[PDB]
Amino acid sequence: KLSELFQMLSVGELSLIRTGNDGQGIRTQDYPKVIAQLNAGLTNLHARFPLLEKEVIIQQYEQISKYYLRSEFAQMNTTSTEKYKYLMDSPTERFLDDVIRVERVFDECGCPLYLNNEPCCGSIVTPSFDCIQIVYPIETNALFVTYRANHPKIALTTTDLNTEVRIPASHEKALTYYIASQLYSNSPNPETAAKGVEWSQRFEAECTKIENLDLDNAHIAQTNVKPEMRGW
Amino acid sequence: KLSELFQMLSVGELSLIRTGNDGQGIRTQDYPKVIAQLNAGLTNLHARFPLLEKEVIIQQYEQISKYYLRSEFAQMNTTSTEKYKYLMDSPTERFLDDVIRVERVFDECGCPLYLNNEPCCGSIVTPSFDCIQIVYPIETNALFVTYRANHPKIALTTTDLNTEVRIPASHEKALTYYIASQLYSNSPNPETAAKGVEWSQRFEAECTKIENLDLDNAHIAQTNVKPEMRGW
Amino acid sequence: KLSELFQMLSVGELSLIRTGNDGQGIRTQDYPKVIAQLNAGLTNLHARFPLLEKEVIIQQYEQISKYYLRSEFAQMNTTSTEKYKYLMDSPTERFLDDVIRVERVFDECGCPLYLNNEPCCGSIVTPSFDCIQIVYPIETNALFVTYRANHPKIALTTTDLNTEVRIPASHEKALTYYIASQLYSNSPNPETAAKGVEWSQRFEAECTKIENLDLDNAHIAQTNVKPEMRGW
Amino acid sequence: GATTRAMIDILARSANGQTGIRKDMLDVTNRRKFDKGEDYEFNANVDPRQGIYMHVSPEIPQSA
Amino acid sequence: FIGTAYDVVKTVYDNLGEIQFIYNFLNDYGVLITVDSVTELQELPTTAKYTRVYSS
Amino acid sequence: VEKFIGTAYDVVKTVYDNLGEIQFIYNFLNDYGVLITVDSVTELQELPTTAKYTRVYSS
Amino acid sequence: GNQAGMVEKFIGTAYDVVKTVYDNLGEIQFIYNFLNDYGVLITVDSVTELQELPTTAKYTRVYSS
Amino acid sequence: FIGTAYDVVKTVYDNLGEIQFIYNFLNDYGVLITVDSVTELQELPTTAKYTRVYSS
């Protein structure tokens, strides 16, 4: 939970600094400063490691060819006045703007489609960082975009400490070292800047350790299918 | 939004500096200083990464052979007194001078044309940094220039903090480090200049990280078509 | 026991520091600071070495395809209001969220299944850091997931000193050096930061020593079965 | 028979086909592209002539 | 192929029109609602203005 | 696909789920005893010696 | 494996109870048989309920004040 | 194959229905409980309101 992370930061890592309040808990006024750094740390960990991969269904409309990955066009977000909401969200999968990289794209039946392929004029291109361009949209089709997902963003004004930070206990130290590095690096004092650099190096060492141990089952080899494809 | 970026700069990165106002928000008098640096940072990120690619239609006139990529000749910009507005803008695609590199040039039907090719006397040459020279213009034709696009420039006198900064959350830190580097490097103090250099190195490390992870799907390989072209 | 570890930390390693109370025992107010660091140390040792490997039975339901490795869905945890508890825990094996890496996955009969294999459409994929996705769940089947397990987490508010820390006596020094490194590294004082770095290096030397001696019977070679598989 | 068995042991117990790939070589998409069999694109800090290695059986000594 | 959940969903989908007609008829005209005890009568929604109770 | 009905896990888990009834049986066997009644003396004989408590109804 | 691990995992501390029940399984069957035929003397705490008992309950003891 | 523990568990499982019936009958109706000495009578649970003691 966020309370545990705040206590851990207050005593042990952010101890000899103002934000830690001498190990008596993070002040209720410095929340929008640890939370901003925490969002960056969670984004870094969720982009460098595959801690959350999710899929989103994009319903194709006859007059729309550029589909934006924004919650304003979501089926569950009822606050938006968009006439056509092509994102197909469910109470289970909500699509809270947590998109880090669009990896794979499928169709309604389940056949993979090419992504960003120029020679094949049947591929789904990506114009901008959050858009999906379908040159050939059909009113009776739906996409099945799968992406690497981010942690649901914790608002800067969040006050409830029961908001759960969903990271494995192995990356707790990596996140904490990242937060310490980011908070220690703001000041231009050489002595404090050196500590910030040391925290950055230690965070990059923890990440290297987790990569070397593959605690998230990311770098796992697959069955070779090249002989079958080449006709052996 | 711009308010979130201003708060993030004020507390955490531009903390021990005048522009940060000791972590109580950027002053309403220092806006035209963070905004000038923010425009440079957005331009750098949008030129080094393909965060926005857009197309513009250039209608050919019988008497015009040098077509300038300026909003003064746009179809939607009604403030200009130009007799012939050959840029074909729409409420969707507006062409707000956000041109970084003219990459590909097509025709009305959709057949690619050569760009800056000397031996072929049917190629679209580029005289200046914002011009398109058509040696053979026809009154019943239109171009389909596609370019890498920049973020719509935020005016130096902008006061509304609801102007949205459209960058992925992964490049938020890269942009913030760039802003810190630019603001810290103005002073000739060796101690502050060292911090500016460190921020520049950290920005160039974040950019290298994003390049290595390809979070924008930029360096993706394509299907090989050389055997087909060579007649194998 | 935790009392012995607290005494050992108080006199000998955390001596010339505040948390040690000059070698008269850890104060009853600094418990939630040694315990937070102790949990991190135990997690590090249990992830880098195979000190505890455990299995959990996941009963498959007809309507559930994504099974989360959380105690909220456990058969013994009666405090949760979940309608379907698919984790099959026993008084012997309790599944206290102590999952570090999902290594092997079997079926009810005992035939190994592929994990994270894309070409084989009969493999158990892992979407998130704590989920198990069964694309083909059957109401009359049960999984036999085997994972590397963590030490049951010691609560930050724990006051009973009889809680046993289950580590071999050979890793007692490794854990103690890790705790000293973590507690010494919070302060930005160069003199204390150097001692923290020295403790980190000594911990990484103890771990290297245990790896070189293989005190946990981890890096042990197996019988070669490749000739039999290849048909020799 | 002993020399023939030694030759077969050298040729068989080795790794004929096991190809190692450096962990920090290709990103998520380029790894899939390399596995499929098309052209890939590697990071600027790694070399293809060192990142990828395919094992072959060591040559039998001429003494056998 | 054992698609038990999908079999149930498809079997419900094949008779979805009956459910739609039932819902429309009950929300359009208004029929008599009968409840066994006085308790569930109070637990009935206020939209059922017409009620009948059977007791011994 | 294969349905696993009646395997070792199923039998063991079925026994485990009924551990309360097994414990009740153990307590009934070891702690106290029940009164078993028959109709005639012949039946008292046709009764196993484990019935240490018997009552016969006769006319 | 002879599936002893499953027994330890599920019947770890109740194996004494299970083995004791298995030892007297014949007497368990005998006790199952007697009860089935209301061969035991059923006791009720008052009248007007001895009638509610099945007619097969030939043997009854009624409690009254 | 010597599965002694599993043999015992399976033998109990084959007669589980008798145990279920015995438990249901004893918890449903209520029979006479007979105890040898006065001690275990006190150690009997309070749920057995009916008791008989045999002494010499």
Q: Helices in C16-140 by DSSP H: which ranges?
A: 31-48
What DSSP designation does C151 have? P
Euclidean distance between CA atoms C200 and A173, whole angstroms: 14
Locate tokens 């390399």: which residue?
D34
Contact (CB<8Å) G43/H31: yes
C38 φ, ψ (degrees, to nearest 5): -65, -40
Q: Is A140 helix (H, G, I), strand (E, B) or coil?
A: coil
> How buried is C232 (Cβ within 10 angstroms: 0-12 exposed, 13-18 middle, 19+ buried)?
exposed
Q: Is B6 helix (H, G, I), strand (E, B) or coil?
A: helix
Chain D residue at shortest CA distance from C232: D12
Q: Backbone dihedral region of B95: left (phi > 0), alpha (psi from -120 to 50 degrees) or beta?
A: left
Euclidean distance between CA atoms A124 and A66, whole angstroms: 10
Chains C and A touch (3+ CB pairs under 8 A): yes
Smallest CA-to-CA distance from D37 within C83, A232, A217, A133 is with A232
**In chain C, which residues have their Cβ closer than 8 Å to the Cβ of E4?**
62, 138-139
Euclidean distance between CA atoms B154 and B39, whole angstroms: 7
Look at strands A99-106 and A142-149 and give their pairing. Answer: antiparallel
Neighbours of H3 (CB within 10 A): 15
Residue D32 contacts B where some CB pair is shorter than 8 Å: no
For residue C112 the two structure tokens come to: 């190994």
Determine contact, residues B196/B181, Cβ cutoff 8 Å.
yes
Look at strands A99-106 and C112-113 and give their pairing. Answer: unpaired
**In chain G, which residues have their Cβ closer than 8 Å to the Cβ of H5?**
2-4, 7, 15
**In chain F, which residues have their Cβ closer than 8 Å to the Cβ of H16?**
14-15, 18, 21
Euclidean distance between CA atoms B144 and B178, whole angstroms: 34
Chain C residue at shortest CA distance from D10: C227
Determine contact, residues A151/A35, Cβ cutoff 8 Å.
no
Smallest CA-to-CA distance from A144 within A77, A57, A79, A39 is with A57
Instruction: Identify the contact set of chain E against chain C, taking CB-CB distances under 8 A.
Output: 2, 4-5
**The CA-based dihedral angle spanning residues B44, B46, B48, B54, taken in that order and rounded to the nearest 10 degrees:** -140
Q: Which residues contact C3 (CB under 8 A, 6 or more apart)?
A: C161, C162
What DSSP designation does B141 have? -
CA distance C18 to chain A (A): 12
Cited resolution, angstroms: 3.5
Contact (CB<8Å) H13/F8: no
For residue A85 the two structure tokens come to: 């909401």
Q: H32-38: long-range contacts at Cβ-Cβ below 8 A with a sequence spacing of 24 or more?
A: H32/F34, H32/F35, H32/G40, H32/G41, H32/G43, H32/G61, H33/F32, H33/F33, H33/F34, H34/F32, H34/F33, H34/F34, H34/F35, H34/F53, H35/F32, H35/F33
For residue G46 the two structure tokens come to: 């008052």
> What one-letter code names the amino acid at H3?
G
> What one-letter code names the amino acid at C65?
S
Residue C142 contacts F where some CB pair is shorter than 8 Å: yes
Contact (CB<8Å) D21/A221: yes
Neighbours of C107 (CB within 10 A): 16
Residue A141 contacts B where some CB pair is shorter than 8 Å: no
For residue E21 the two structure tokens come to: 């007609």
**In chain A, which residues have their Cβ closer than 8 Å to the Cβ of B150?**
none
Smallest CA-to-CA distance from C176 within C25, C16, C5, C48 is with C5
Residue B92 contacts D where some CB pair is shorter than 8 Å: no
> How buried is F42 (Cβ within 10 angstroms: 0-12 exposed, 13-18 middle, 19+ buried)?
exposed
> What one-letter code names the amino acid at C11?
V
Give partners of C (≥3 CB pairs < 8 A).
A, D, E, F, G
Residue D2 contacts A where some CB pair is shorter than 8 Å: no
For residue A128 the two structure tokens come to: 């901008």
**In chain H, which residues have their Cβ closer than 8 Å to the Cβ of F33?**
33-35
Q: Which residues contact A38 (CB under 8 A, 6 or more apart)?
A: A5, A154, A165, A175, A179
Determine contact, residues C38/C175, Cβ cutoff 8 Å.
yes
**In chain H, which residues have their Cβ closer than 8 Å to the Cβ of G40?**
31-32
- Dihedral sign (CA C21, C27, C30, C31): positive
Look at strands B142-149 and B99-106 and give their pairing. Answer: antiparallel
Q: Backbone dihedral region of A21: left (phi > 0), alpha (psi from -120 to 50 degrees) or beta?
A: left
Residue C182 contacts A where some CB pair is shorter than 8 Å: yes
**In chain F, which residues have their Cβ closer than 8 Å to the Cβ of H26?**
24, 28
Euclidean distance between CA atoms D41 and A175, whole angstroms: 30
Contact (CB<8Å) G21/H1: no
- Interface with C, mutate which of E1, E4, E8 (most C CBs under 10 A): E4
Locate tokens 């195979």: which residue?
C50
Contact (CB<8Å) C93/G9: yes
CA distance F28 to chain H (A): 10
Euclidean distance between CA atoms A14 and H21, whole angstroms: 64
> What one-letter code names the amino acid at B189?
N
Neighbours of D50 (CB within 10 A): 9
Contact (CB<8Å) D37/A229: yes
> What one-letter code names the amino acid at C204?
E
CA distance F25 to chain H (A): 7
Determine contact, residues D57/D16, Cβ cutoff 8 Å.
yes
Euclidean distance between CA atoms A112 and A193, whole angstroms: 48
Euclidean distance between CA atoms A134 and A107, whole angstroms: 12
Q: Is A99 helix (H, G, I), strand (E, B) or coil?
A: strand
Residue A205 contacts C where some CB pair is shorter than 8 Å: no
Contact (CB<8Å) C230/D12: yes
CA distance E12 to chain F (A): 25
**In chain B, which residues have their Cβ closer than 8 Å to the Cβ of A183?**
12
Write the residue in F26, F29, F37 that is nearest to G40 by C-beta. Answer: F37
Neighbours of C192 (CB within 10 A): 17
Q: Identify the helix (H) or strand (E) that includes residue B210.
A: helix B190-213
Determine contact, residues F44/F53, Cβ cutoff 8 Å.
no
Length of chain E: 56
C113 φ, ψ (degrees, to nearest 5): -115, 155
